[PDB]
């Protein structure tokens, strides 16, 4: 409420949002001997230790993380809460993956005791990997979303989540109705939206599993609550696209289904977007919609390769998602490593600065939270990660041989996993410690 | 005379080599309550605990690894010893990667104290990841191959290694001559080939960096020592293939340069093989040559996707390699994870049985050592790894949630790292235990 916290160490952040990756080098900030002052869970002062140490009264001990690297909390823009335990070994693609693996897994989260246990486990996985803000697919059952929101509220986490809307083309145990989906999402909105740092997303799974009536209910919810988020899947798989064209033949493609139902615009986030024509690229760019780039699940399911270069050209906001469930890791560093491989296959060179930006401030911007999180600017919420770049013998050996900042970022990205995460602070408090 | 060791736990191995990945299930033996008796570094007896417990003498206590999974030691068919510390810039490709990072890194190994230190480090990395047999690229300098062989012989490891032969198209500090290369490789063969379990490989880096004179010297070495190995790189990158076509215009492509110099045949291993014509597939298959599949470096360098399906159709032996240096991990589980993604991109489903097979007995077969290692058949050399498939909370959850054995192998493949390696035995001796 009024007590100060002081953290010294080496910091990396990006001081402003940009519009081309070539700009990132001029917005990146690295302070080897830096100092972060925290009050009321927000950044109070940040800069060089020699310019700010006078502000620390003799009554306070500084959290001394010298030798570590302190970065803003990672931002995961697409992840499924009720899918941590999922294993899909039989090399299925998207639709068979949904019927064989996704739905039976999410069925176990109808139990509220199981949902309660797994919500704590899910949040701990996030913190364990340095993710402090995520845009989260929930369940179809509203009480499991209640459990997830309660677990996140325990630590005053900034999280966007919502109930999945799906009333057709899925097993009976995982279906709602248009009317029930409207009313349950409305109850969750009134209970959790802008409850502390929590935020609600109107979350239809995708167009195949929602009737026109349910799509209208999602449109109605967005009109009644214009400051909520929208979150859905878009053009992940070609068979999915053909299925959509078969189910909505009178619309001008896949994205046009969401557009006609008023589900495009700012803070509307579309996961995957692997197979877009120009109609849809330009629509996303004019409506200022966001994309959740999920390279790992794209690879595992053989969906394809996301065109990050065309996203930069079209001025579309892109953030990174793990798509846990189909993806296998909660870790943002490994996600960026897989993105690097995906882009190398397209001849696109992903710089370390660009990867770091997409992991932090770029993801926050894609979620419309860049005024709240993403760097160490005074006034930002104090979500950050203390990383140990020497946490593994090979990682330490390659870090001991890196002198430049790009070398350090590249080593962190290519060799990093959960062991690289030494401590995680959320709302200015230590909420995870690797020990 | 000699004494026994008893190892109890859960075991899995493949009991014979196959030629179609569909037969692997028929040859996969899983013993849930099993006993492995070791004498003189070899499998004395293997089978069900109740069928063999009577053979355990009163003088020895059994090593009880119940709750773990015991597998044959992993076989790494292409790895570069003097490259563990290499940190590369982002986005650069094979030939520029070679000239900017690979050669200056390998230059530091002229110092023999540094070579000794890194030889110990390299062996430690192999052991802690469960690799008990590797086909290893050495240096151009004979002293570093001496250091590597000394480290491997200290623990009586079975390792194939050799001095790099390269006399052109590289900085002067990393070049030999045809005559010096022949004589240095002959001295290393005379000192180390069949010294204990050690084996020598005639190792020209690739055709671009070897003159016709040096290629003739390598041919001569292979003719004088027909039981040595041959190990080189082949059709990794399209620019590399075009370079080879310039430097040997009178040969019918890349593989034919090696073939005309009599360097194809049994125990000849060609790394990468990403861009093969159908001529070259048939030539590899008729000469019974082997391929080292390295998915991680293929993806980092934008090389392409190895066609494992055509390798099975053409009946060419394939093993897995890390290309440590360009690759970022010593770990075979992660290597198979990357292979799974590469094959998903090609529409090929890599089975858990197939991945496990290529990691153990299939790899030994590609190296021509399947009569000595690769499973728990009586008489085989006792190189094995005790694995902890539940080594992290997420691994434990996904392993519990798996019902079939292929699901458990898949969990290990997608989530496993060095933390999965609990114990490593080489030559019937415990040589690594996780701290
Ligand atoms: Zn998803
Ligand atoms: Zn190599």
Q: A235 labelled as ligand-binding?
A: yes
Distance CA B345, CA B298 (A): 13
Q: A206 labelled as ligand-binding?
A: yes
B90 and A410 within 8 Å at the Cβ level: the answer is: yes
Distance CA A138, CA B46 (A): 49
Ligand 2 centre distance from Cα of residue B268 (Å)? 15
Distance CA B144, CA B111 (A): 8
Q: Which two tokens stand for residue B116?
A: 């000794």
One domain for residues B421 and B311: no
Ligand 2 centre distance from Cα of residue B323 (Å)? 5
Distance CA B224, CA B407 (A): 48
Range of the domain at B168: 73-374
CA proximity to B296, closest of B308, B286, B305: B305
Q: Which two tokens stand for residue A203?
A: 């979350």
CATH classification at residue A327:
3.20.20.140
Strands B131-137 and B160-162: parallel
- End-to-end Cα distance, chain B: 34
Helices (H), A78-177: 94-97, 103-107, 112-128, 142-154
One domain for residues A309 and A413: no
Residue of A nearest to B345 (CA): A302
Provide, as residue numbers in chain B, all residues whose Cβ is less than 8 Å from the Cβ of A400.
85
Nearest by CB to residue B125, choosing from A394, A402, A414, is: A394
One domain for residues B263 and B383: no
One domain for residues B202 and B345: yes
Provide, as residue numbers in chain A, all residues whose Cβ is less than 8 Å from the Cβ of B397.
84-85, 121
Nearest CA to CA, how far is B406 from chain A (Å)? 7
Q: Which two tokens stand for residue A383?
A: 């979500």
Radius of gyration of chain B, Cα coordinates, nearest whole angstrom? 21
- Which ligand is located closest to the Cα atom of residue B94? 2
Residue with tokens 């409305």: A186
Q: Is A93 exposed, middle or buried (0-12, 13-18, 19+ CB in 10 A)?
A: middle
Is residue A170 within 8 angstroms of chain B, CB to CB? no
CA proximity to B385, closest of B358, B359, B351, B353: B359
One domain for residues A155 and A83: yes
One domain for residues B381 and B338: no
Ligand 2 centre distance from Cα of residue B223 (Å)? 24
B398 and A85 within 8 Å at the Cβ level: the answer is: yes
Distance CA B75, CA B363 (A): 5
Number of Cβ within a 10 Å radius of residue B335: 30
CA proximity to A231, closest of A194, A204, A260: A204
Nearest by CB to residue B344, choosing from A299, A341, A414, is: A299
| DSSP code, position A324 | B
Is residue B403 within 8 angstroms of chain A, CB to CB? no
Q: Select from A354, A374, A394 the last residue of a domain.
A: A374
Q: A80 labelled as ligand-binding?
A: yes
Distance CA B48, CA B56 (A): 13
Which B positions 308-367 lie with beta carbon below 8 A of chain A? Answer: 328-330, 337, 340-341, 344-345, 347, 349-350, 352
Q: Select from A355, A374, A393 the last residue of a domain.
A: A374
Residue with tokens 């053989």: A302
Q: Which two tokens stand for residue A3?
A: 């007590």
Distance CA B243, CA B226 (A): 30
Give, in order, the Cα–Cα distances in Å from A272 to each of A82, A87, A357, B139, B326: 19, 20, 19, 44, 29
Q: Which two tokens stand for residue A366?
A: 């894609």
Nearest CA to CA, how far is B395 from chain A (Å)? 9
Question: How was this entry determined?
Answer: X-ray
Nearest CA to CA, how far is A305 from chain B (Å)? 9
Residue of A nearest to B324 (CA): A394
- Which ligand is located closest to the Cα atom of residue A233? 1
One domain for residues A289 and A261: yes
Query: Which residues have C-beta under 5 Å from ligand 1, the single-atom ion?
Result: A 323
Nearest CA to CA, how far is A406 from chain B (Å)? 8
Is residue A411 within 8 angstroms of chain B, CB to CB? yes
A393 and B345 within 8 Å at the Cβ level: the answer is: no
Strands A158-162 and A198-204: parallel
Are A307 and A293 within 8 A, CB to CB?
no
Strand partners, A269: A231, A290
Number of Cβ within a 10 Å radius of residue A223: 9
CA angle B199/B203/B204 to nearest 5° reads 170
Helix (H) or strand (E) segment spanning residue A46: strand A42-48
B394 and A330 within 8 Å at the Cβ level: the answer is: yes
Provide, as residue numbers in chain A, all residues whose Cβ is less than 8 Å from the Cβ of B400.
85
Distance CA B243, CA A105 (A): 52
Q: Select from A374, A393, A425 the last residue of a domain.
A: A374
One domain for residues B381 and B353: no
Sheet with A28-39: list strands edge to edge: A42-48, A28-39, A4-14, A63-72, A384-387, A421-426, A429-433
CA proximity to A5, closest of A50, A36, A48, A32: A36
Resolution, in Å, please? 2.3
Q: Is B327 exposed, middle or buried (0-12, 13-18, 19+ CB in 10 A)?
A: buried
Nearest CA to CA, how far is A139 from chain B (Å)? 19
Q: Is A171 exposed, middle or buried (0-12, 13-18, 19+ CB in 10 A)?
A: exposed
Strand partners, A158: A133
Q: Annotated binding site: which residue ranges of B?
A: 78, 80-83, 205-206, 233-236, 323
Q: Is A19 exposed, middle or buried (0-12, 13-18, 19+ CB in 10 A)?
A: exposed
Number of Cβ within a 10 Å radius of residue A14: 26
Number of Cβ within a 10 Å radius of residue B250: 7
Ligand 1 centre distance from Cα of residue B128 (Å)? 35
Q: What are phi and psi of B10, to 5 degrees?
A: -95, 135
One domain for residues A60 and A91: no
B86 and A344 within 8 Å at the Cβ level: the answer is: no
Provide, as residue numbers in chain B, all residues whose Cβ is less than 8 Å from the Cβ of A351.
90-91
Q: A260 labelled as ligand-binding?
A: no
Query: Which residues, including other chains, have CB under 8 Å from residue B356's CB and lie 6 or more apart?
Result: B12, B14, B28, B71, B409
Are B153 and B202 within 8 A, CB to CB?
no
- Which ligand is located closest to the Cα atom of residue B81? 2
Q: Is A396 exposed, middle or buried (0-12, 13-18, 19+ CB in 10 A)?
A: middle
For chain B, the three-class secondary structure string (H helix, E strand, C coil) is CCCEEEEEEEEEEECCCCCCHHHHHHHEEEEEEEEEEEECCEEEEEEEHHHHHHHCCCCCCCEEEEEEEEEECEEEEEEEHHHCCCCCCCCCCHHHHHHHHHHHHHHHHHCHHHHHHHHHHHHHHHHHCCEEEEEEECCCCHHHHHHHHHHHHHCCCCCEEECEECCCCCCHHHCCCHHHHHHHHHHHHHHHCCCCCCEEEEEECCHHHCCHHHHHHHHHHHHHCCCCEEEEEECCCHHHHHHHHHHCCCCCCHHHHHHHCCCCCCCEEEEECCCCCHHHHHHHHHCCCEEEECHHHHHHCCCCCCCHHHHHHCCCEEEECCCECCECCCCHHHHHHHHHHHHHHCCCCCCHHHHHHHHCHHHHHHCCCCCCCCCCCCCCECCEEEECCCCCHHHHHHHHCCCCHHHHHHHHHHHCCHHHEEEEEECCEEEEECC
One domain for residues B195 and B274: yes
Which B positions 73-132 lie with beta carbon below 8 A of chain A? Answer: 84-91, 121, 124-125, 128
CA A381 to chain centre: 17
| A349 Rama class: left (phi>0) / alpha (psi -120 to 50) / beta | beta
| B6 Rama class: left (phi>0) / alpha (psi -120 to 50) / beta | beta
> In this complex, how many residue pairs, one in chain A and one in chain B, have their CB atoms less than 8 Å apart?
100
CA proximity to B158, closest of B330, B341, B321, B374: B374
A340 and B90 within 8 Å at the Cβ level: the answer is: yes
Distance CA B394, CA A118 (A): 11
CA proximity to A247, closest of A167, A326, A139: A167
Are A360 and A72 within 8 A, CB to CB?
yes
Query: Which residues have C-beta under 5 Å from ligand 2, the single-atom ion?
Result: B 323
CA angle B231/B254/B280 to nearest 5° reads 90
Give, in order, the Cα–Cα distances in Å from A311 to each of A21, A247, A291, A293, B364: 11, 28, 9, 10, 45
Q: Which two tokens stand for residue B234?
A: 């082949």
One domain for residues B251 and B305: yes
Strands A421-426 and A384-387: antiparallel
One domain for residues A219 and A283: yes
Distance CA B39, CA B382 (A): 9
Interface test with B, best of A97, A125, A344, A418 (most B CBs within 10 A): A344
Give, in order, the Cα–Cα distances in Å from B193 to each of A161, B18, B149, B372: 62, 29, 10, 16
Is residue A137 within 8 angstroms of chain B, CB to CB? no
Q: Which two tokens stand for residue A106?
A: 């999410």
A125 and B330 within 8 Å at the Cβ level: the answer is: no
Are A335 and A322 within 8 A, CB to CB?
yes
The total number of structural domains in chain B stands at 2
């Amino acid at each position: 409420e009024h007590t100060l916290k002081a953290v010294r160490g080496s910091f990396i952040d990006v001081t402003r949002t940009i519009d081309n990756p070539e700009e990132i080098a001029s917005a990146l900030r690295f302070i080897e001997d830096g100092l972060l002052l925290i009050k009321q869970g927000k950044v109070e002062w940040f800069g060089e230790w020699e310019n700010g140490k006078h502000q620390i009264p003799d009554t306070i001990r500084v959290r001394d993380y010298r030798g570590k690297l302190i970065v803003p909390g990672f931002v995961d823009t697409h992840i499924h809460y009720p899918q941590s335990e999922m294993v899909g070994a039989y090399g299925e693609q998207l639709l068979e993956w949904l019927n064989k693996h996704t739905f039976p897994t999410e069925r176990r989260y109808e139990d509220l005791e199981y949902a309660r246990e797994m919500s704590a486990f899910f949040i701990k996985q996030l913190l364990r990997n340095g993710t402090t803000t995520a845009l989260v697919f929930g369940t179809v059952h509203p009480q499991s979303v209640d459990a997830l929101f309660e677990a996140a509220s325990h630590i005053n986490m900034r999280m966007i989540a919502g109930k999945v809307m799906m009333d057709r083309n899925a097993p009976d145990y995982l279906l709602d109705t248009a009317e029930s989906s409207y009313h349950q999402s409305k109850e969750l909105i009134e209970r959790w939206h802008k409850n502390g740092r929590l935020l609600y997303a109107i979350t239809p799974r995708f167009a195949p599993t929602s009737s026109p009536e349910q799509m209208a209910m999602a449109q109605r919810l967005k009109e009644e609550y214009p400051d909520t988020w929208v979150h859905t899947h878009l053009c992940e798989n070609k068979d999915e696209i053909a299925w959509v064209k078969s189910l909505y033949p009178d619309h001008d493609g896949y994205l046009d289904v969401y557009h006609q139902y008023g589900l495009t615009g700012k803070n509307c986030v579309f996961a995957h977007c692997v197979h877009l024509e120009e109609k849809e690229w330009d629509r996303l760019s004019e409506t200022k919609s966001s994309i959740a780039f999920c390279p790992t699940s794209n690879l595992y399911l053989g969906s394809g390769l996301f065109n990050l270069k065309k996203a930069w050209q079209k001025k579309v906001k892109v953030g990174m998602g793990t798509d846990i469930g189909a993806g296998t890791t909660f870790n943002m560093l490994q996600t960026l490593n897989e993105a690097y491989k995906v882009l190398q296959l397209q001849g696109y060179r992903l710089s370390a600065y660009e990867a770091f930006y997409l992991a932090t401030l770029g993801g926050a911007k894609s979620l419309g939270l860049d005024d709240l999180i993403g760097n160490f600017l005074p006034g930002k919420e104090a979500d950050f990660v203390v990383m140990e770049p020497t946490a593994t013998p090979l990682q330490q050996l390659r870090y001991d041989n890196s002198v430049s900042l790009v070398d350090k970022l590249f080593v962190m990205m290519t060799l990093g996993d959960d062991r690289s995460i030494y401590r995680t602070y959320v709302d200015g408090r230590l909420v995870y410690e690797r020990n």
